[PDB]
Design an enzyme around this catalytic site. Structure first.
Site, PDB file in Angstrom:
ATOM      1  N   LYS A  77      27.939  27.552 -71.293  1.00 54.78           N
ATOM      2  CA  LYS A  77      29.667  27.630 -71.097  1.00 54.78           C
ATOM      3  C   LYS A  77      29.784  27.671 -69.607  1.00 54.78           C
ATOM      4  O   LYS A  77      29.041  28.819 -69.063  1.00 54.78           O
ATOM      5  CB  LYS A  77      30.315  28.415 -71.691  1.00 54.78           C
ATOM      6  CG  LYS A  77      31.982  28.194 -71.980  1.00 54.78           C
ATOM      7  CD  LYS A  77      32.542  29.161 -72.742  1.00 54.78           C
ATOM      8  CE  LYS A  77      34.167  28.895 -72.809  1.00 54.78           C
ATOM      9  NZ  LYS A  77      34.692  29.708 -73.710  1.00 54.78           N
ATOM     10  N   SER A 152      37.925  27.370 -76.557  1.00 60.31           N
ATOM     11  CA  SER A 152      37.422  27.084 -75.300  1.00 60.31           C
ATOM     12  C   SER A 152      36.117  26.728 -74.948  1.00 60.31           C
ATOM     13  O   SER A 152      35.598  26.149 -74.065  1.00 60.31           O
ATOM     14  CB  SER A 152      37.957  27.881 -74.155  1.00 60.31           C
ATOM     15  OG  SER A 152      37.276  29.218 -74.314  1.00 60.31           O
ATOM     16  N   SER A 176      37.763  30.989 -79.779  1.00 68.54           N
ATOM     17  CA  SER A 176      37.004  30.071 -78.724  1.00 68.54           C
ATOM     18  C   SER A 176      35.491  29.812 -78.891  1.00 68.54           C
ATOM     19  O   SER A 176      35.136  28.834 -78.235  1.00 68.54           O
ATOM     20  CB  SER A 176      37.074  30.453 -77.251  1.00 68.54           C
ATOM     21  OG  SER A 176      38.315  31.530 -77.110  1.00 68.54           O
TER      22      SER A 176
END
Lengths: 456, 479
Positions: A77, A152, A176
């Site tokens: 990420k 996310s 997330s």
């Protein structure tokens, strides 16, 4: 092709001399080059650099495997620093932020031999269940390109689901990891307090402890063995994170009792989601678990208190600073949804919410002495269309929150949880990660193997 | 006397003569009391009577034991004697204890100093208390506190003012002032307190005894009777710990109370960490902005020399400017006191307590805007990270506790804003420890040793450099 294989399977090919590390990396990079225009999930690549790493190991060691992640391609990420990659939070203003050092979690994966292919897409600020950024655009779900990948950690989930990488690294503040993992049909493990340190040697912004208590790092993968491998590698104290502990892992509990969460947090569930919950109950019972319904108390306040605490900070601290730096749909998601729960400007209201958080945490900790696992939906619906949270207004945002009420209570109370590819999760007590993964393996023994998607 | 050996290391003197100098158990450490019981020279009941008789003689002067359980503890002692005799049981068998009003003891009342709570009768012990009792400790009663436990002066509506047994015109400190006074007066061997903004270290130092603020994870705070729910931010800054006249007694009590209980979210099953081989010591003097008396600087310097003599490397002028640390503590605590606590309890608390909060905490409180509070929470995390990094090099920090010796009893009584800022400035070496979640041992000379989270045994080892060289702590007779 190795893009379809788990970490153990890739490593077996390398050790048998059937593939080199460089060949493995080329297979993943070629697949990314073919299909990543459709998913937009790898937002920054380090192709030349990772091929050099792969070749280096091939030349020095050949078919002899080094560390436990040697030969395994990784997605990381954007949020987690990788030396030589940009860390942007999705924002054009941060396009020049280039890190000199890995985060500790990333460093541990790389020290174990992992081959980082690049950074994965995110929403602006990492505050959204839809990975849409100003700098990179929208991540699309490889299982159905009309649909959100979640967020996310949507890019990492999409990368793993598409066979662009074997394992992804995300974090989970309000679902997330779990939301995008389930919506992309892969496993996503939110670890618990103490295990994986969050350390950024490049210098992050300082965070409120309340927010830090609710967030944890974890892996995304296509099998439980890969989840556990990455989890174990990343676990270990680092005193640069106050939340990190030297406590070891705890062996799985003998015969944990499982409580089912269905409507006790007030969630609005689709029939299809209820059917997956029931299917998972069946699988666990066939594997010898005692699973009990209608044993949990009324916990509708738990997701609400999460939204109050997080929303108050977003509305009164974060938006005032970044409102002009984020895309309009990000600003309006915050205003429309978090605006419904934020507590207003009075510090007394915020202090009251913090007290309620402690109360709920103690109540749930007490009941989890009897029910050491909670089985629950993740989202109340299957992966929605890309526009599901785009300028939808207050009323529709409350409805969306109500669909997601099985998700953020986990963060509020500081609990580890594994999301399964069918959109159901297993929540455990603090420190009980291995009990969760054992229950995960019961699902894995019953359900078909996760297969990669070919974006089209 | 004739029923005992007279060891040959004591040359010539008659056994009976030697024994005629034996001090009452009110003057002894836990080990010395236990040795007397094991030799058959004292019963547990005798030990308890000696302490209760001393309390009866002198507690009207100190007001430090506020609720006794005399009949109950005498029954416990007799039961243990009758069953077990001179055979010791657990590691705290025979040792009289003082417990702060804050911590539940079955059959006593937990009041927070407020008369309105005089009907709060607890059926069960807190977990920390229960552990001390299960090891054999003999709880004599509850010790005095300030209203709300927010004051460095133990003055309550219910019980009045605790006075320092070393000089009754002076404060005993607070909020664990009663326990420090009980230990300093020889009313109990060990006390149990807690520390949110110096609430163990300050009274221990001002009463000339040891006080150990333990660190995150070790001792659980669990009230089975049902306590009030608290803000995690406040919980992160508070820890339980013992008060005693020797480090062995500190360490004994600490070891007994340590262990997981999942009813406290802050409790951890992590074991104790063995002392670090050769930790480096940083000296905190003026780096938090403290205003220090010459006498306090002299004790700091004396302690540096004791540590150096033991072989520690001790460095001055290595810490950055940390004046924000005590300020951020006051901002966070003050904002909650002024915007949450006082609105609910102002009518139930004594005026001097309310006015201490307004006069001192009102200087630092952030106002009503939640944005300002969130900003202060971010700054707390920033300071914590900075100090944790420094403490990888300097694993111990040596610092003053208070900037002055025990002040007069009225030192914080209706003093106003400017005088309250001056008082805060004298105390700036104290609350940064709480803000950052660090264990710390206060020595009887008013100097402390602060360590990293989980490093309690390293701190206690360093404290022994002082104990090896300093005169032994002696009890005071209130007069």
């Amino acid at each position: 092709e190795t893009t379809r294989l788990t970490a153990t399977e890739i490593r077996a090919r390398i050790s048998e001399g059937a593939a080199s590390r460089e060949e493995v990396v080329h297979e993943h990079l070629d697949r990314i080059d073919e299909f990543n225009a459709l998913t937009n999930s790898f937002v920054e690549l380090r192709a030349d650099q990772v091929l050099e790493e792969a070749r280096a190991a091939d030349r020095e060691f050949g078919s002899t495997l080094g560390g436990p992640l040697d030969g395994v391609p990784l997605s990381i990420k954007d949020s987690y620093s990788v030396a030589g990659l940009h860390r942007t939070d999705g924002l054009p203003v941060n396009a020049d932020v280039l890190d000199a050092q890995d985060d500790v979690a990333t460093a541990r994966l790389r020290a174990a031999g992992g081959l980082v292919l690049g950074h994965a897409g995110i929403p602006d600020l990492c505050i959204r269940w839809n990975s849409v950024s100003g700098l990179y655009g929208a991540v699309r779900n490889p299982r159905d390109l009309s649909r959100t990948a979640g967020g996310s950690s949507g890019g990492d989930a999409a990368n793993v689901a598409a066979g662009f990488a074997t394992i992804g690294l995300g974090g989970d503040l309000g679902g997330s990891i779990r939301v995008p993992a389930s919506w992309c049909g892969v496993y996503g493990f939110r670890t618990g307090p103490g295990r994986i340190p969050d350390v950024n040697p490049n210098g992050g912004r300082s965070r409120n402890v309340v927010m830090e208590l609710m967030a944890q790092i974890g892996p995304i993968a296509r099998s439980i063995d890969d989840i556990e491998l990455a989890f174990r590698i990343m676990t270990g104290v680092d005193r640069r994170d106050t939340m990190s502990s030297p406590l070891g892992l705890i062996e799985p509990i003998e015969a944990p009792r499982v409580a089912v969460l269905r409507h006790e947090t007030g969630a609005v569930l689709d029939s299809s989601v209820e059917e997956q919950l029931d299917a998972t109950i069946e699988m666990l019972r066939a594997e010898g678990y005692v699973v009990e319904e209608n044993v949990l108390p009324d916990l509708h306040r738990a997701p609400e208190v999460w939204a109050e605490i997080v929303g108050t900070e977003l509305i009164h601290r974060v938006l005032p600073e970044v409102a002009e730096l984020v895309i309009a749909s990000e600003r309006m998601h915050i205003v429309d949804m978090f605006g419904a729960y934020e507590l207003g400007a009075d510090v007394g209201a915020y202090l009251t919410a913090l007290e309620e958080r402690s109360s709920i945490q103690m109540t749930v900790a007490a009941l989890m002495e009897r029910y050491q696992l909670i089985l629950a939906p993740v989202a109340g619906m299957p992966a929605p269309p890309l526009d599901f949270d785009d300028h939808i207004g207050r009323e529709a945002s409350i409805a969306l929150f109500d669909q997601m009420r099985c998700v953020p209570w986990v963060n509020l109370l500081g609990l580890p949880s594994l999301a399964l590819p069918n959109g159901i999760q297993l929540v455990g007590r603090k420190h009980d990660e291995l009990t969760i993964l054992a229950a995960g393996r019961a699902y894995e023994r019953r359900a078909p193997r996760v297969e990669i998607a070919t974006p089209a």
